[PDB]
Structures are given as C-alpha cells and as structure tokens.
Ligand binder design. Sequence first.
Ligand SMILES: Nc1ncnc2c1ncn2[C@@H]1O[C@H](COP(=O)(O)OP(=O)(O)O)[C@@H](O)[C@H]1O
Ligand SMILES: Nc1ncnc2c1ncn2[C@@H]1O[C@H](COP(=O)(O)OP(=O)(O)O)[C@@H](O)[C@H]1O
Ligand SMILES: [Mg+2]
Ligand SMILES: [Mg+2]
Lengths: 505, 646
Amino acid sequence: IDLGRVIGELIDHRKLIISITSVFTLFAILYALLATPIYETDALIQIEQSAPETALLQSRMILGKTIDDLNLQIQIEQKYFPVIGRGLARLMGEKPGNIDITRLYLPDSDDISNNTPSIILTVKDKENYSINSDGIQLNGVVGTLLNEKGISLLVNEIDAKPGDQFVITQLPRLKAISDLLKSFSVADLGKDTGMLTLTLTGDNPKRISHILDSISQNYLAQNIAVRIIDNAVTDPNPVRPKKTIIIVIGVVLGLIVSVVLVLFQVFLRRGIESPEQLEEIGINVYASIPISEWDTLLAVGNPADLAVEAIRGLRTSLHFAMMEAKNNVLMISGASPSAGMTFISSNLAATIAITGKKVLFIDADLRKGYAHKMFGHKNDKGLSEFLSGQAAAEMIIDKVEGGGFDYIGRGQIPPNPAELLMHPRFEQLLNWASQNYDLIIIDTPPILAVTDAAIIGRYAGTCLLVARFEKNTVKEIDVSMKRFEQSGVVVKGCILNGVVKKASS
Amino acid sequence: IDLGRVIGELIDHRKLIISITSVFTLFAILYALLATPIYETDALIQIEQSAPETALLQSRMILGKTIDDLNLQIQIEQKYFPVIGRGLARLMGEKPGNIDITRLYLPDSDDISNNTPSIILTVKDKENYSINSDGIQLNGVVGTLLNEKGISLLVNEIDAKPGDQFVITQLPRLKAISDLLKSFSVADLGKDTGMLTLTLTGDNPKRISHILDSISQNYLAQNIARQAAQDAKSLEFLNQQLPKVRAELDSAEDKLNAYRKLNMEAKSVLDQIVNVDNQLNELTFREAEVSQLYTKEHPTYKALMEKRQTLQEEKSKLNKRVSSMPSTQQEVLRLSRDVESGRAVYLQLLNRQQELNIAKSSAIGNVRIIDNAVTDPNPVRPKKTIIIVIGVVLGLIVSVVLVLFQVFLRRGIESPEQLEEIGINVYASIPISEWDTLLAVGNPADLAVEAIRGLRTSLHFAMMEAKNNVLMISGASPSAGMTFISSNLAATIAITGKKVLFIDADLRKGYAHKMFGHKNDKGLSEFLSGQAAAEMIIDKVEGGGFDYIGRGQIPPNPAELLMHPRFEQLLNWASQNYDLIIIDTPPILAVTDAAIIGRYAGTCLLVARFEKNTVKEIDVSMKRFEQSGVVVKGCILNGVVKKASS
Ligand SMILES: Nc1ncnc2c1ncn2[C@@H]1O[C@H](COP(=O)(O)OP(=O)(O)O)[C@@H](O)[C@H]1O
Ligand SMILES: Nc1ncnc2c1ncn2[C@@H]1O[C@H](COP(=O)(O)OP(=O)(O)O)[C@@H](O)[C@H]1O
Ligand SMILES: [Mg+2]
Ligand SMILES: [Mg+2]
C-alpha cells in the first residue's frame, strides 16, 4: 500500500470521522463539566518509627472515635431526580443547601439486604418540613424534637429553598468507617523523619477539613494519654475530575475509533472502484456513467446533464464498435437487478434517436419491466401478447411522446417467460424489425438471476453488460461473461454505471 | 490467508459461536449466583520481633484452646438434597436456621476410614426432633438431655421451620484444628511494627467474628499470664501434685496388671464416663481460670456452670447404667476407669505445667488488641464480575478454536473455481430447493428450476456437433443428484415442445418409476434379458411430457447385462424417434455401469455435490472415464447454498 491511498480514504470518510470525534468530545465535555468536584485537604503531623503509627492511624478505633464525635453516620444527600441534576445545578450557580442534624434514629427495618434505613425529608419552608419513610407522611418543625412511629429526629438550621428534598440515611457504623478509610491516606514523605502527611479527599470543602482536624486531635489526645505542625487545610482547586486530560482522552479515543472503523470499512469493501479492475481481466469498459442528481427520460427532461453527456460518449463509442456486426441489434444486460439496464438502454435509445436515426426499443424484461410506465403507455398488446400468438406485429409498437423512438412494452406478465422467448416468432419479429429500423435495443433481465438474456443473445448482433459502481464485483462480472460464453453469446464489453467522484482514486 | 476469509467464516458460524458462548455464560452465571458466599473478618494486634509470634499464633496449642472453648468440633450442616439447594434457598430469601449444641458424644464407630461419626436430626416442631444414626429412629426434646444407645446429646434454642434436617458430625479435634488453620492467616504489614493483621474467612458472618475474637483473647491471656504467674503459687502446686498423680497412675497400672494376670456395652459406657470425666476436669480448670481472670456474672462463667451441671447429670445417668450391669464386668470397668482417668489427668496436668512454663517464659510485657475482629459485609468470594468475564472469554475462545478446527478440516468443494482450476468446465450450479414428484412440475418457479433452465440453455449450445443426441448424466458418489438433475432437466426440455426420452439405467437402486407413477412391469432389465420388446417398456409421465423407461426388476448381473448389443440397438432405435435421450447412471467410483453406457452417449456430464464430494474425487472420476474411452464434457455442481465466506 501507499500513503496516497490512506490519505484519500481519510478525505473520503472525513464526515464520519468528524462526526464520531465530535460526539466523543461532546460526551467528554459533558462528563468533565458535570462530574462532582472532589477537593483534597491535608495536614502535617510531627512524630517525636512512623510505620506503626501509619498502621494505627487507619485503625478502626481512631476513625470510629472521630465518627462518633462528628456523627458521620447520618448521611444527608441533596436530591436531584436525574444522574446530571447536581452538575447542572452547580453550573447554573444554584447554591446547595444543608441541614444540621444532631440526633437521628430510624426504626431499623434491617431486612436481609438493606441494612441501611433511610427517609426522605421535603422542605416546606424555613421552619417546618415533611418526612416520608415508606409513604407515611409526617410533619416536623426545626427545633422541637420528633419522636413518632419509632423514629427519633432532631433538625437544626435548615438552609435551602422550600420545595427541596433530601435523602437521610442512617448507615451502619462499620460502613461509615469503611467510607472514611477509603478516601483517607497517610504517608511519611521522609521514610525516617517525624513528618507524616495526612490526606483526605471529599466533596465538601469544609466538612473534610473538620474531619481531618478531628482525626488529628483524636490521635494527639490518644497519644498524650507528637505535635501538629500543620492543621488540616483544603486546596480550593479540585483534584478530580481533571478536565484537560479527560478532554484529551476523549478526542484521542474518538480519533482512534474513527480510524479503526474507516480501516474496517476499507478492508471490507469488494465492489468495483475504477474501470482498471475490469480492464485487468480483459473486459473493455466502454463508458462510465456518473450518478444523475436530477418517471421520465433523463435524456429528455434535462438533456444537458452529465450522465447524458457520458451516454453520448457511449453512443460515439458504439457507432464504431457496432460496425461489421452481423445485424443492427444491441442487447444491454447485466449481472444483478437494479444495476441500470433500463436506464442506460432507454437513455441511449433517446440519444441515438435525436440524431435522425430511427430507433426501436424492446423491453424483453417479461418479469418486472416498467418501460411503458416511464414512456406513457397503452399497456394492451405488449410483447407477451405477441409471443403467445394472440396479437400481430403492428399493434405492439408505440411512440414515445418526448422521445422519437418506437417501443414495445412487455405487456401482461406471463407465467412462462423463458419458455415464451424460445418461440420462433421472436426471431421473426427481430428479423422484420431489422429491415425497418436503423437500430434495435433490447433490454433484458439479469443473467445471474434468470436465463432470458442468454436466450435473447443469440439474435443480438452486439451485447453489452452493465456493472454498478459499488454494488457489483469483478467476480460477478466475470461469472456473467463466462455464463454468456457457455450459452453461445459473445459479449462485446462492459459499461460501468453509478460513478461518483472519490478522492482515493 | 486474508481477513475476508476469517470474517466470512465467523459470520457463517455465528449460530454455533453464539450458542457456545451463551451456554458457557449461563454456566458462569449459575455458578456465580449459587456459590456459597464467603465473608472475611479481620483484627489488629499490637505487639509491644513478630516472626516468632506469627509462627506461634498458628500453633496447635492456641487453636486447640479456642476450639475447646467454642466447641468447634461439632459440625452442623443444614441439609439440602442437591448440590444447588443451598444457593436457590438463599436466592429465594429463605432464612437459614441454626441450632445451638453444647454437648455431643457419638458412639465413635471409628472404622478403618470414617473416623468422623455423624447423625441426622430432623426438625418436627419448635420443641422436639428426631435422631437417626444408621436408621435407628429416636425422639428428643430441646432442654432435657438425651443419653441413649451410647449417644449423648444436648440441644438449645433450635431455630428452623419444622421438617428441616441437619447433619451433625463429631469430627476429630485435629481435623477441626486443620480446618480452622486452613482459613486463618496472619500478616505483619510493616515488617518491623508491633502491628499484626489477623484474617479469618468463613461462611457465617457472626461465627467467624466470635472465633477470631476468641483467638485474640486466648493469645493475649496466654502472653499476659506471665505477670500473674511469677508470684503465683500454681507453679509449686503443680510441681507437688504431679508426682502424686504419677504415683497413683503407676499404682493403677500395677493393679490392672495384677487383675489381668470385653463387653461392647461395658466398653461403651466406660468410654462415656471417661469422656465425662475429661470434660469435668477441663471444665474445673477452665472455671478456676475464668474466676481468676473474669467475673461470675460474666456469661461465660454461667455457661461453664450450666455445662458442669449437665455433665453431672450425665455422670449420674452413666452411674445408674453401670449399676444396672453385672458386677463381673463392673470390676474390670472400674479398673479401666481408674487407669484411663489417671492417664487423662496425668496428661492434663503435664499440659498445665507446660502452659504455665510457657506463660512464665513469656518475654512480651503486654500484647494489646488495637482492633477487635469485625466482619466485612461484602463477601470476598465468589467474585461475580471476574467469574462472568472469564466465562464469556472462555466461551469465545472455545468457539473460535472449534470454528478454526472445522475450517481447517473441510475438504469439499466450495465454488466452481476449484473445479475450473483443474480444467473442468462447470456448466451450472444448482441451489438447494427448500420445497416424490418432480420439482420442475410441482413448483415450476423455484430457484433450482431456474438454474436447470440455465443448464438447458448451456446444453443447447454444448450439445451441438455431437455424434448423436444422447446425454448421460453421471456422478462420483451416490446421493449426489444424478436422478434429480436428470429428471428435472428432462422435464424442462420437454416443456419446450421437444420430445424427450428418459432412461433409468441405474439397475441397482433406481426409483424413477416411483417418482413418475409406474407400471413397474417390463422395465429395462426385462428388455435387456430378452423377455420383452421395445414397445412395452416406454411409459408416459403424467405431469411431465416426456417418455421414460424404468429399470424394472433388479437383475443379478447388471453390468453384464448392459454389455448386451440389444442395449445399443435400443439406443439407435430411440435416437431416430426422439429429439433427446437422457440416461441416468449409477456412480462411477462405486460400479462400472456408467463407463459401459458412456460408449454410446454423445455427451457425458458429471454431477458434483457441493460440500460432500471433493476435487480429488471428481478428478479421479474424470480419469476413470478417460481410461474406459469416454470423454466427459464437464461437471455440474449441485446443492449450492449461499456462504458469506465466498
Ligand atoms: N446513472 C444513474 N443515475 C441516476 N439514477 C440511475 C442511474 N442509473 C440507474 N438509475 C436509477 O436507479 C433505478 C434502477 O435502474 P433500472 O435500470 O431501472 O433497474 P434494472 O437495472 O434492474 O433494470 C432506476 O430507478 C434508475 O432510474
Ligand atoms: N438441488 C437439490 N435440492 C433439493 N433436493 C435435491 C437436490 N438435488 C438432489 N436432491 C434430493 O436429494 C436426494 C438424492 O438425489 P438423487 O439424484 O435422487 O440420488 P443419486 O444421486 O444417488 O442418484 C434425492 O432425494 C433428491 O430429491
Ligand atoms: Mg430493467
Ligand atoms: Mg440415481
């Protein structure tokens, strides 16, 4: 391979790459701007060793004493319904509220799994509030204690707007100790000094400072029954999330996934890409019709389109190729349906009729042909009604309105098309028409699907295949060529279709 | 190779890969949701070194003391019949029951292998229960002790629904110590500090906490005993008492020797009394030590006194039972009682002396318990997420390797390119027909009939300039499609207004007359043998349009019949009255009928099954036709299916 190919592929798939990278970067931005900030506080302790003290600091005794002092077993959570309500509330400048609780005791349901009882407190005003545990609504007031239904609760100094809601959970002492220990760290930083650095990470900038101060005071008072060089202070800059690295990771991940997806798509495409592939095998590509961005003939509605120019080029190629042929019958066929046989054949008939030569257009697609729909029709007495013998050769031929060439529609769909096409009346029709017209163009069904094309091809002076740009493959075209060879029909060449401009070319 | 091939193979075998991965993931889910949870408890000990203490913690002395304290030698298992009953019971929210047992003693069968006696206790209500050891059913009640058939049992506070069953095993002390030590671990975590982390893993969240607490308390009390031992008179008391007990033991031994120079019930009650005496002596020592180091109102002391009362009750019952026995055995029973009691007390006092020396020679001034044992509510095993990930990855791996094995073990044809490489013109490729009647008649618009019409158009040009109008369809292996292709082709050529004759020259297993509607008399055999004319053999297909000649009766010498010149006369006569003659033949790799017939055939075509036959078989068939003087025009693939790997 070469760099030109990969650059062309990247340029071609720029839209997909940009879209994927943009969506990944947007997700990264949302996460980095909605994640709850996590502040870090630290303290410095002088030890008058330091390994046993490091192990003893994180013992459940000291942390439990601190939790009992600060009532860390009463979890209060401001309630936002979604997973992003807190982030947007912080972004909108909304001030988070807080409630000071000094006494809580829930009935302690203590089922198999949920060992943590919880209630919901809704703020009604600055003074009173509502409590619901399992739908049981009660009214309480700040100040006076509440002792009802096995629930004891004391509220002091509630600071929030009315209508706010808070989840109040009485989690077990061990769970609170584990939570505190999970975010609390100790280091020596000298490996021999009396200096110990204590670190605590949490989302409340003042609560973590108070907690670490309490931990240090408890440790010092326990030992005195060691000096605090630096009382705990909180860094105002959050340590998580790190927005810049998150955005960089998002952008890089988007680029990587876009690149690998583009590589997968490139290595999984098999369709034709240029007439060079067909010319390698030994097939003369007679044209390359581009896609027409424009139920009427393109060669009539928009005679100056690019596709009609390509078809005029094909007409000039044919005027020399179709010399010294045994007769003046051209058969346009294909490999797979919806390739362009009818489009190419009809437009070519129009472009050859506009030059003053009489043209006949036969729609021998007795299975799904719709030429009469595209030309304006008297659908009676098609090709079928002639082949079966219930019509003459004169009532089948009609005139296109904006064309200039005659046509013979299929007519009624027969039950035995391929068995009809073998009738000698078909050859009689072609022989009669060849003496009254300058050109006869026969449209046929695919050859990979049915065998009508190979039956008709015996009486065709020239035969041309039509290959779709991206859909068909070189293998399909080669198989079609060989299947025409076996049946005794010599294919002149191919005609690419549906071409679009690709930067990788 | 290329990535396209492997992607195509994966897409083709998506069903197998998905099935295998799904079943493996289901098994992983079942294991991760049915495995018994294992909780972990831990404790933190301060050492006032730490390597000798690490070795001493896991010594049999401390663990044995803990087991004797907590009666860990009485294994109680809730009974579920299957290997998954416990998991589903836990999943269904069923509350597991428990029984508190303070005294158990089984008859101790003690055979060659099963040194662990066991019984089954079935819950009948909140109060009474049933006991079965080897089918012997007994009824007991919580509270009142049971002492029957050499079985002593005490039950307190049974909490389960009636109808539950429990296996009660009295496993040996050493086995219990090994089980406890297997799941118990100690670490230093500082390599120099006095901090030791003790870990214990078990399935009962409270029992493991109690066990680890007991271990820590025993270790601390053993270490601290030094301070309350140097001045303790227990040292001299033991130093004086031991010679007396040894002298008594020697006297009992001499008396037993003198009396010596085997009743099952007698020996059983002897062992019962020996056990009771051992428990009483050890309980007396434990009560003394607890009264020294604890208070009477402490629940442990009350447990000791109730156990002592129960032991006294059992001793009274055993004494009554002895009083019910003849004195001739009672004398030997008393002698054995004295000897065994002396031995047990001697060993117990030796242990007391050794433990006292252990305490006195203790160097650590005071070991402290920083953190009493607590249990993590989140189980440490099984780890569900990693189990599921491993299951999914294993399923993917086994599916991939199986697909690779199948891909590298296939040899059949896959595309007409393989046959065209060797130099064989593949004239068609008939797809499989998802639809005992001709396909070209029942469903004339099927894909296979379209492919056969393509073959007909190919033949109409191939069969030109041939020496006559006879076509011979043959094959390599049976059940390839010779009759299917030949009959359908005859139908599709007859529907175009050309007269067709169909000869079924498969004189061994031909069934054309079955598929066409038959007058089975006067087949091909009856003509070749000479017992029929050329006119009674030809019949008309009903929904066809072509004549046919069935095989008829199976002859004993088919290949020797086909060499008769009357066969050539028949073909020459038929060639002047029909537009086409199609002859079906048996395979050529199996028999030689095809090569005999092929001399008079203008055109010959082989039929190759898609996946079954191989390029080698087709080449061998071509060469075997060449040797016999028959020129094969080409091949016809059959049974084609759409494969993504193409
Ligand atoms: N170069 C082209 N530009 C725009 N539309 C095309 C082109 N070629 C074919 N088509 C359109 O795509 C459809 C399939 O082509 P058509 O020839 O009618 O079917 P078939 O190949 O099976 O006979 C048609 O509706 C046709 O108008
Ligand atoms: N393309 C096909 N689609 C569906 N069934 C087929 C096809 N080809 C053969 N068979 C069926 O499989 C069986 C074997 O084919 P057959 O020609 O009758 O045996 P043999 O090849 O030994 O003479 C037959 O029952 C036939 O109907
Ligand atoms: Mg068409
Ligand atoms: Mg057969």
